[model samples]
Target: MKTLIVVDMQNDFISPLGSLTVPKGEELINPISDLMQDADRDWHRIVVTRDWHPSRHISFAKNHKDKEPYSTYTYHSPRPGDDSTQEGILWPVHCVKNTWGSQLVDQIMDQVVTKHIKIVDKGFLTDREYYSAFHDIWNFHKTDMNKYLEKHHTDEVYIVGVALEYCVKATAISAAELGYKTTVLLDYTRPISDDPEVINKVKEELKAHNINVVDK
Candidate 1:
């Protein structure tokens, strides 16, 4: 079975009034919505994810004293087999649980009205920062997304959504790392920053690992 995984299409990432809005993130709505509803290709299931963080989540800049959003800080919490102090990016507080920013855009939500789509909520932990849909920041807990895919007998997963350099990239990389055949829809995702260097690096990393990135 082929599954289409749309990562972080929440208002916090796509809406104009969102806290940490990605440039042109709203543009993906129509294409992704159409794909889900048109049935041009047979997708066994569709999965949507959101950044469901608690107030003052560890990734938020306001949580750390003297820190600012988009700045990198040395993360100190280390789990088994992990680095003691890794670099982490901080963002403005967004996606508080049950808030409007955490909700999916109406267009995508409309697609789910009649479909049995699975919704995976990530980054709800106050101590951890979650960029990948499959697991928490420290890999301590998984979001049950993988189990859902396995239960559905998924063979390939195609990814699309906002902020190509962050959540979208993390999810795709982790999916490929998990031995799932992964493909990223290039044109359907927009980056938080328009830096060509960061975008190229993301592409390079994915290509290095043999993830099939496509445009169609």
Candidate 2:
């Protein structure tokens, strides 16, 4: 069965007043909404992923001293990898659980005739960070999404949402990795950065990974 996955089209990622609003994020509402409203397609299920993080989440820049949101950081601390060094992008506090920013944008709610909608809330673990709907950022644990799709016998998935480079891209790539026919609707997503190449790079990476990326 054909599936649709909406990845983090939350207020904090899409609204103009949001703390981490993606560039042109609001523009994607129409395309995604229209696709969700399509009655011709055999949609077995629809999945929506949200960054339902706690305020004390480690991903928040505020949690670390001398760190700023959107800044890069390196942790010399050691984990199981024993690399003794790690680098990652820091983000502002946005999608705290139960906050306004964590809620889905109204544009999508208005038009989505969702009957079999599965809401996957992630990043609730204060010590870990999550990006893809399938797993935490550290990949220590997997979400129930893969099993959910398998249980429903889903074959193909069309993904769309805010912040093309992070959540949407990760979800699409994970979907493909799980042997699903993954297709990303590029026009229905936006990136947090103003740089066009950020999304271009993501598109190229997706294409290289055998994931289909289409503007339509």
Candidate 3:
């Protein structure tokens, strides 16, 4: 058994609301919908990761002085048993839980055409860096989604969506780090940068992490 996790493919990060959205961010939904349609045929579980957040969530750089969104910034790791300092890629004031822009894009939702879809809400907690859908790294709390996957004997996992180098990359890397045979569906993702060199570099580095980028 395996799972297909759709990372944040929301309007804020895909439409006009996104302060730093990528080209073709809107393109993700089609392929994702296709994957979902045949998931049962391929024998896998399908889960989705959402960017649920609060207006005051620490990851939002809007609340910080002299700071800008989408830049790498430092945030103190939560107390006790977590001594290492944590770094977060600050984001714009978007995806405040239940906001209109935070909802899933219709392209992915429209074609899903089914029930029993599991939604893994990441970045919901206020004080943490939550790159991986499985959990917030800075908060030091496990998402338990992985535990459920394991308990169900779902080993071959397919992860896709959103900014390839950040959230999607982090989640994919973390999946590999946790010893899961994971694959990152490249065409289903896009970058937030206008620079082709940077995007290509990020793609290359993703390969270094052993995340296969299948050309669609």
Candidate 4:
């Protein structure tokens, strides 16, 4: 059994020159579409994660003191021993409920072959940022994706979609740790961080953690 997990490839993250644009991210639509089409027809389990945030979510840099839209800030997290629990990120306010930024982009969704697909909307509740689609890290709320897929007898789960550095990265690793054989479609994503080193470092860490990376 196999599953396809489409990450937050929404307008705010995937549109041509979006607020948080990932270089060449729009180019990823075709590959992700191909995967979605295949998954629609054959994959036993299929899920999509959308970055559905409330309009005033605290992760918005604008909310913090003196931080401009593209600025980075350090915030504490529930990471067990991560004293530096600081997450240095640059983001604009996006994906507000029912806003255009929150809507699913048509490029890949139009290719979805199934009618009964499950979608997980994350990042809105309590201002706690959600990176992992599998579980809202701070909330500890399992998206129940694993159990749902398992109940359907799903085995290997293949993940695809946008913002290669954050949500996609977090979700894929968590899936692997939760006992699913996981693979991230490398070329099907675009990195948000400008530095080339960040992408390389993430790739190294994921590989070391045993989550497979599929080069397209």
Which number leads on TM-score? 1
> What TM-score does candidate 3 reach?
0.87
Per-candidate clashes, comma-separated: 0, 0, 0, 0
Q: Write the per-residue lDDT of candidate 3 for residues 1-216, one digit (tens) a residue.
A: 767778888878887656556677766676677767773547467777778888899988988888887788977777666567866678778778888767777776553435656677788778786878876775367686788778778877777787777788878877877878878777777777656786678678768877776755
lDDT of 1 by residue, 20-113 (tens): 8988888889988887765767988899998899997888999989989889987766476666676899989888889999989988876666
Q: Over 4 Å off in model 2, which ranges?
A: 75-85, 110-116
Off by over 4 Å in 4: 39-41, 77-84, 111-114
Worst 10 residues of 4 by lDDT: 107-116
Alpha-carbon RMSD to native, per candidate: 1.7, 2.2, 2.4, 3.0
Q: Given candidate 1, what's the lDDT at residue 36? A: 75
Model 2 weakest 10-residue run by lDDT:
75-84
Q: Predictions ranked by TM-score, top down?
A: 1, 2, 3, 4
Candidate 4: tens digits of C-alpha lDDT, residues 103-150: 778875554435557878878675467788877755456676777777
Per-residue lDDT value at 95 in model 4: 81
Q: After TM-score superposition, what is the CA distance of residue 93 in candidate 2 from its true location, in Å?
A: 0.4
1-216 per-residue lDDT for model 2 (tens digits): 988999998899889898898878888877787777788866788888889888987888999999899888764432465555457777999999888889888776544434546888878777666678998765667898999999999989989987788888889888998999999988888888789789889999999889999987
Report the alpha-carbon TM-score of model 4 versus the true structure: 0.87
